[PDB]
Design a protein around this ligand. Structure first.
Ligand SMILES: CNCC(=O)Nc1cc(C)ccn1
Length: 165
């Protein structure tokens, strides 16, 4: 199971780890992707997860979009986890760099409550432009299921732990 995590709350855990390497190791039931509404997995966590699936995540995602249309910001869909996990929960946090409403971050985290345990990144962090400290706060205050957060950047991980209220 999950190892080396620091416990932040009753249900939230955090580790300085590459979520792809973490998923390959644990093979969790659910890995969360930091998706966009089009499921175009170009960069950040999505580009890294998709590259680890040899683009199978993108091929599956294109078929999903062709059938269903785009997701909503704050929404999600469950697709295959491919070689990384049983399922991938593609969750769309607001992209501050696209001028999207940061208030949608709580709605994005609410998707995690449909799964008992998840391996996840901080939503809207990184290339999505939100403050990762704020994302962790919304995560702790929204998610009630067991969430194992993988933070790639060591310097950000240290800042998140040291500033955690
Ligand atoms: C291509 N490098 C892998 C990578 O960026 N992995 C990652 C990224 C974030 C933001 C969180 C956890 N893991």
């Amino acid at each position: 199971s999950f190892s080396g995590y620091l416990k932040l709350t009753d249900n939230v855990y955090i580790k300085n780890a590459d979520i792809v390497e973490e998923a390959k190791k644990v093979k969790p039931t659910v890995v969360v992707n930091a998706a966009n509404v089009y499921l175009k997995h170009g960069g950040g966590v999505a580009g890294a997860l998709n590259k680890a699936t040899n683009n199978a995540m993108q091929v599956e995602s294109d078929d999903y979009i062709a059938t269903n249309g785009p997701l909503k910001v704050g929404g999600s869909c469950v697709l295959s986890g491919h070689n990384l996990a049983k399922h991938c929960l593609h969750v769309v946090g607001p992209n501050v760099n696209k001028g999207e409403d940061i208030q949608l971050l709580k709605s994005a985290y609410e998707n995690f409550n449909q799964h008992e345990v998840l391996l996840a990144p901080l939503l809207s962090a990184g290339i999505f432009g939100a403050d990762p400290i704020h994302s962790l706060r919304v995560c702790v205050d929204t998610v009630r299921t067991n969430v194992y957060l993988a933070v790639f950047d060591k310097n950000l991980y240290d800042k998140l732990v040291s500033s955690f209220l």
